[PDB]
């Protein structure tokens, strides 16, 4: 009876226990936090065992009243899509605890409080069918990320970085809130099952689609609004910055799948070229911007921006394979970008430069880090045999089947992906060794070596045999694509 | 050492104990 309620309660118990633990007992704080995170991960994994990937309706649901007339209420559940996101969210956080394990004495227990709070917070986002409360938890993640960026930021310029990441989010959040109010006042409720079965007005469809796009175009970096991610992402702690591109970047893109595509069937079709003309030029402009960059963190963030703009093309291209490929690409990106930021943060925790000019010739030393970095660069390099290529090949297939022009521009993205990532790899860990700057340096010890092991095994597993991921959600994608129309 | 010998505190103490008795009765009798 491993229901969804316990999956959210366990991080809450972990946080509550940590609150009343003295700061001196640094031995116990890290142990109990890591144990709580791992129990949450196992409790998420066991859900995959009892998933029952057969029904079109939703899986285990928990209903808790929220208004006196049961008008709108906490209504949990997963269908076929948020399950993998829940699993990956539960898996990334223990890595966050492990990476920031050595320096926990300075961080204190407040470091784990924020991470566990955000943990069950993002857990409650993906499995939340009620539309309004999905927005409550959708913007609830502002506070933990604000605190993580500000309190434990690397450099002093973190003050300006957090303001953009906050206000850009609030603007779109309230723009969406207005649409939510319009929908609730018109329909009457915000439950997802009912609200998907309401005849809307075409003139009303376009306005509400635009209102949702006001914020969902900020979470996924679009052409007009993508400045926040690099500035507010290079300036975050490695344990914290690894989930801005890990789970905090998948809200809006996944929010399109659950609250835009089946919600507004007649508006996405009318706005399809606009999304194409935004994302196709995004994958070009951001990729070109990536080349002339010097900071080690910003290049990975820009590559992440390009990957999200690519997955947006395959998501709005309504195909049974386009959406599945979008989900595979999003999971693969969540793995690879997380791994890449850990790889570029372990360098910072030893030398504290964040400049490619200083780094050079790191193959003559720390070869294990060089091998890991090369593998994850190849994964970002979009090679077949890794989970990414399975990710964007289906995107290209779905785009080309609908529009021929958009597929060529999208594949220009994976052509241009070999210009910055390979250049970074050859300019950081394969150059000429310079003893003037990097006087001394060690290699990865047992902690960061074990950190990349789950990443590597999951990468290979989902790259060579992505059947189980596609097997578990073919029904849900089929139901999502076929909606509103009957032919 | 057999009497508190304070003709002001004892009334306060008996008031406190009768208040406690009243509280427990009010919880019980209602």
């Amino acid at each position: 009876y491993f229901n969804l309620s316990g999956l959210i309660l366990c991080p809450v118990l972990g946080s509550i226990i940590l609150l009343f633990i003295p700061n001196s007992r640094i031995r116990l704080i890290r142990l109990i936090g890591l144990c709580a995170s791992l129990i949450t991960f196992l409790y998420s994994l066991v859900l995959w065992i009892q998933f029952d990937s057969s029904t079109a309706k939703f899986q285990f649901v928990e209903s808790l009243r929220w208004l006196p007339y049961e008008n709108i209420n906490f209504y949990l559940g997963i269908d076929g899509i948020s399950l993998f996101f829940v699993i990956l969210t539960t898996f990334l956080i223990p890595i966050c605890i492990l990476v920031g394990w050595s320096g926990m004495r300075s961080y204190g227990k407040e470091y784990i409080i924020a991470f566990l709070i955000c943990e069950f917070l993002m857990i409650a986002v993906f499995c939340m069918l009620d539309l309004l409360l999905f927005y409550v938890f959708f913007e609830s993640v502002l506070i933990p990320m604000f605190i993580i960026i500000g309190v434990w930021g690397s450099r002093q310029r973190k003050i300006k970085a957090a303001y953009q990441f906050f206000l850009y989010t609030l603007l779109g959040s309230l723009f969406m809130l207005l649409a939510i109010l319009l929908i609730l006042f018109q329909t009457g409720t915000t439950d997802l099952q009912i609200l998907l079965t309401t005849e809307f007005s075409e003139r009303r469809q376009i306005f509400l689609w635009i209102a949702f796009f006001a914020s969902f175009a900020v979470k996924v970096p679009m052409v007009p609004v993508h400045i926040w991610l690099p500035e507010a992402h290079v300036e975050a702690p490695t344990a914290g910055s690894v989930i801005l591109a890990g789970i905090l970047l998948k809200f809006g893109t996944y929010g399109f799948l659950r609250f835009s595509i089946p919600m507004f069937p007649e508006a996405t079709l009318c706005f399809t070229p606009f999304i194409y003309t935004l994302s196709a030029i995004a994958i070009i402009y951001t990729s070109l911007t990536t080349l002339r960059q010097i900071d080690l963190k910003k290049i990975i963030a820009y590559s992440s921006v390009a990957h999200m703009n690519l997955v947006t093309i395959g998501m709005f291209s309504l195909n049974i394979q386009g959406i599945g490929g979008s989900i595979l690409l999003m999971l693969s990106h969540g793995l690879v970008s997380s791994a890449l930021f850990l790889c570029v943060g372990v360098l910072y925790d030893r030398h504290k430069t964040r400049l490619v000019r200083y780094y050079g010739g790191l193959v003559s030393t720390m070869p294990n880090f060089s091998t890991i970095f090369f593998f994850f660069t190849l994964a970002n390099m979009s090679l077949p045999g890794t989970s990414s290529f399975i990710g964007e090949f289906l995107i290209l297939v779905g785009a080309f089947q609908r529009n021929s022009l958009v597929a060529t521009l999208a594949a220009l993205g994976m052509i241009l992906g070999a210009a910055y990532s390979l250049w970074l790899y050859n300019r950081v860990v394969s150059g000429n060794l310079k003893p003037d700057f990097l006087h001394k340096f060690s290699d990865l010890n047992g902690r960061e070596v074990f950190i990349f092991i789950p990443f590597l095994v999951g990468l290979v597993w989902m790259g060579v045999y992505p059947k189980v991921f596609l097997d578990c959600m073919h029904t849900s994608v089929s139901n999502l694509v076929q909606h509103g129309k009957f032919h | 050492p057999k009497v508190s010998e304070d003709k002001n505190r004892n009334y306060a103490v008996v008031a406190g104990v009768v208040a406690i008795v009243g509280s427990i009765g009010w919880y019980l009798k209602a």
């Binding site: - | 050492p1 057999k2 009497v3 508190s4 010998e5 304070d6 004892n10 103490v13 008996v14």
Partner: protein, 263 residues
Amino acid sequence: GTLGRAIYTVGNWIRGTGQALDRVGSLLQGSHRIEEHLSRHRTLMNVFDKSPLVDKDVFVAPSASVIGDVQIGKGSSIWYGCVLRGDVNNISVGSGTNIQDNTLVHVAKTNISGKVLPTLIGDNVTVGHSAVIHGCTVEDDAFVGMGATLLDGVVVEKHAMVAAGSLVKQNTRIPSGEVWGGNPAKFMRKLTDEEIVYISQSAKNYINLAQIHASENSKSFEQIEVERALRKKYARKDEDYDSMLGITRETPPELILPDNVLP
């Protein structure tokens, strides 16, 4: 009356229950806590048969441990943590001195070199914080720096400041008007009249400062509680309501320091 008797009986019952519960809580700890017990530390004890003859005007802090035959003159004072151990030979502390905080005075066992003499301190002599005097023979009106480490056989003359943190070696004589410091003898400089005035004024300042510490450290329980309550009552002032009520509140004399110790 009878109500008072009943309340006293209830108090005894409550006290017994509380003591029993305290005992149970102590047992649950595994008896891993050392009980507080009582202050066994005693000032002015007898080492073998000889008592320290301390004058009436002397201030001896309760934390001090003045043992052995110690002769202390009028007007002088012994401060907190200081140890006047005089087990073997007499320690004739003069009148008007001040053995300051955490200072140690010890005397060798008449055989450190074969011609050992008891420690003697003159008059109007300041010793300083955490000094170590082991067999010295300080004479009247001499300055000792804080943390000094005067070993045996040393004699400091009048007005012969030892620098703080010094390590005056064995049988080292400091001439009057000279300032010696550092690990070796290491003469620094001559005396100045500003400095002699400073020495005299500091010596008299500690004498007219010691009596307030002497009075405060020797207040009865029924008196210290009264002073604590009075200090709490007059912690802060309020001229508004004082003027509106037509009254004035003056601090009690027992809460006012004498004007000699104010800057």
